[PDB]
Ligand binder design. Structure first.
Ligand SMILES: [Zn+2]
Ligand SMILES: [Zn+2]
Ligand SMILES: [Zn+2]
Lengths: 65, 265, 43, 98, 113
């Protein structure tokens, strides 16, 4: 639904990285590999967490109530 | 101080990259395990949901709260709730935090670990403060709110260890390596043509002599030098993760001595 | 408050067995959360 | 909510007087989820599925195109991966957690 | 049907930390059941026992991953009590970790953050 707090495999805090990663993509106009390295996500376990996250919360929020 | 030698190569507020030497593999390992598994830490262990009107389930959120790392610098001063003589939780063994958020904009409202508010009495122990590490002082994104949506909640942070639940682990990963050159022949390299070519040399090949080909296999040599790097999740300063790593292990072994002692008496 | 939220129009409401099941005039009604207050283990 | 004037084993304790539990209430086992009576009184209520539990999520009250007051109770549970749960890659081999 | 997860580290009731049984098939051997412990103490304490020369046997095992307990078997040369070897292996360990903590703390203060 939203950014998981920690990387499943090692527990790095990752839930604080999502807004910046969006920003790195759109306004610094960077690619995803470089984006994630700039966020210090070296271990590919951590990379997977943000790279494959799907932010469905953004759709749920469009419901009326 | 003859015994286990420590060096150090990087050190920062999040990682300490060190070389252990003059130790048997077991000990390097038990310390590795402990740091992952047994260092006491503070973390939300109970949520009371007053109103949730978000698009998430209460337990979905509750799950996330427990994963927010809390300041755990002074945790030995906090009691294990299960040992505390109080009825359930109190200031001697728990920290109580509040979350109130309302979305009062057409724009979409974010809820972060910075919005948690200590409401219990901290007795001036440095403990409980949610850990913040990003440039804008937000910490973790807990939730997101549409206009008119609401979230009111009370959590109790309690002392625990990784063994009980991974939200208590102070440590992220622990890089561990010895014998980068395979002198000891502890591994056996799979190959198509040449193992030398197909296998990349690790960082640590720089810090050790490559074996000279005109040489008998060294059959007495042992794993005694270890290339470690400990990464702290923030809830304790790294230097501590290692330090307290060593400590908890001491307390553990000593505790076995007190049991032998106790079966004379 | 009382008993039922409303599917749309969000109106807090309560009736029994007067009236019949309506609002808006929408005929879908939701029970409000208990005041009972639920505890979660955050595990 | 009926009270013995042939009911079911699990308690009726959790229902409000209109006959329905309410979102937030934690149910389990055999608890009466829906309280229904037939005229003193023969009991026709809906127990919760024996092997389950969770929290009540939404309760909806409404009517069919003619007459019937009817009712739908959604119940939420979280399910943590656990010995014996099934998992598969996208290549047609499942396995369970040993 | 899962047990509480605190049972990996929390003793009892009815349970004590150590059971010592006097083996059977070998002179001077002992079998210690450690409760609420795993490979962290097991491999450690054993490895150290094995640097004792008056120790002719040291070995541990976790019989099943579900329960947290290990069995540890020490046999020693005559006139040397295995319970004392365990003692010595422990003390020997308590030190080496002290030594290490201190050394680490030393190297830490040298650092520029
Ligand atoms: Zn990771
Ligand atoms: Zn207390
Ligand atoms: Zn309405």
């Amino acid at each position: 639904m939203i950014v998981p707090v920690r990387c499943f495999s090692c527990g790095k805090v990752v839930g604080d990285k999502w807004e910046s990663y969006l920003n790195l993509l759109q306004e610094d106009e960077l690619d995803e590999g470089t984006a994630l390295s700039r966020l210090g996500l070296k271990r590919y376990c951590c990379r997977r967490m943000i790279l494959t996250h799907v932010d469905l919360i953004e759709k749920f929020l469009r419901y009326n109530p | 101080e003859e015994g286990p030698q420590v060096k150090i190569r990087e050190a920062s507020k999040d990682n300490v990259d060190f070389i252990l030497s003059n130790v048997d593999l077991a000990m390097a390992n038990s310390l590795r395990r402990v740091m992952i598994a047994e260092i006491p830490t503070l973390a939300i262990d109970s949520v009371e949901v007053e109103t949730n009107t978000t698009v998430l389930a209460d337990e979905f959120i509750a799950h996330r709260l427990g994963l927010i790392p809390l300041q755990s610098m002074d945790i030995e001063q906090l009691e294990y709730s299960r040992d505390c003589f109080c009825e359930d939780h109190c200031d001697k063994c728990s920290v109580v935090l509040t979350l109130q958020a309302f979305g009062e904009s057409e724009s979409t409202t974010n809820v972060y670990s910075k919005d948690l508010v200590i409401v219990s009495n901290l007795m001036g122990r440095n403990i409980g403060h949610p850990i913040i590490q990003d440039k804008e002082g937000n910490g973790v994104l807990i939730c997101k709110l549409r206009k008119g949506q609401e979230l009111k909640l009370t959590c109790v942070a309690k002392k625990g260890i990784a063994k009980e639940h991974a939200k208590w682990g102070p440590a992220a990963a622990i890089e561990f390596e010895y014998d980068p050159w395979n002198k000891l022949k502890h591994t056996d390299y799979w190959y198509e043509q040449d193992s030398a070519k197909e296998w990349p040399q690790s960082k640590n090949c720089e810090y050790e002599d490559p074996p000279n080909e005109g040489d008998p296999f060294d059959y007495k040599a042992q794993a005694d030098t270890f290339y470690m790097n400990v990464e702290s999740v923030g809830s304790i300063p790294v230097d501590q993760v290692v330090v307290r790593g060593i400590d908890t292990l001491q307390k553990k072994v000593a505790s076995i001595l007190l049991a032998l002692t106790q079966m004379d008496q | 408050t009382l008993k039922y939220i409303c599917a749309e129009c969000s109106s807090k409401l309560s009736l029994s067995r007067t009236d019949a099941v309506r609002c808006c005039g929408h005929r879908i009604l939701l029970k409000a959360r208990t005041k009972r207050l639920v505890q979660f283990e955050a595990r | 909510k009926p009270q013995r004037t042939r009911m079911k084993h699990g308690t009726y304790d959790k229902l409000d007087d209109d006959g329905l539990i309410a979102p937030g209430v934690r149910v389990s086992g055999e608890d009466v989820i829906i309280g229904k009576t037939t005229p003193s009184k023969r009991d026709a209520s809906t127990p919760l599925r024996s092997t389950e539990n969770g929290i009540v999520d939404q309760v909806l009250v409404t009517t069919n195109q003619d007459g019937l007051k009817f009712v739908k109770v959604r119940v939420r549970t979280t399910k943590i991966p656990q010995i014996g749960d099934k998992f598969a890659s996208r290549h047609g081999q499942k396995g369970t957690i040993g | 049907n899962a047990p509480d997860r605190f049972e990996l580290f929390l003793l009892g009731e009815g349970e004590s930390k150590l059971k010592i049984d006097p083996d059977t098939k070998a002179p001077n051997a002992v079998v210690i059941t450690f409760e609420k412990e795993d490979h962290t103490l097991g491999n450690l304490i054993r490895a150290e026992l094995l640097n004792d020369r008056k120790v002719l046997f040291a070995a541990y095992k976790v019989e099943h991953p579900f329960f947290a307990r290990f069995k540890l078997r020490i046999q020693t040369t005559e006139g040397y009590d295995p319970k004392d070897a365990l003692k010595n292996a422990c003390n020997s360990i308590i030190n080496k970790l002290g030594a290490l903590k201190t050394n680490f703390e030393t190297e830490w203060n040298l650092q520029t953050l």
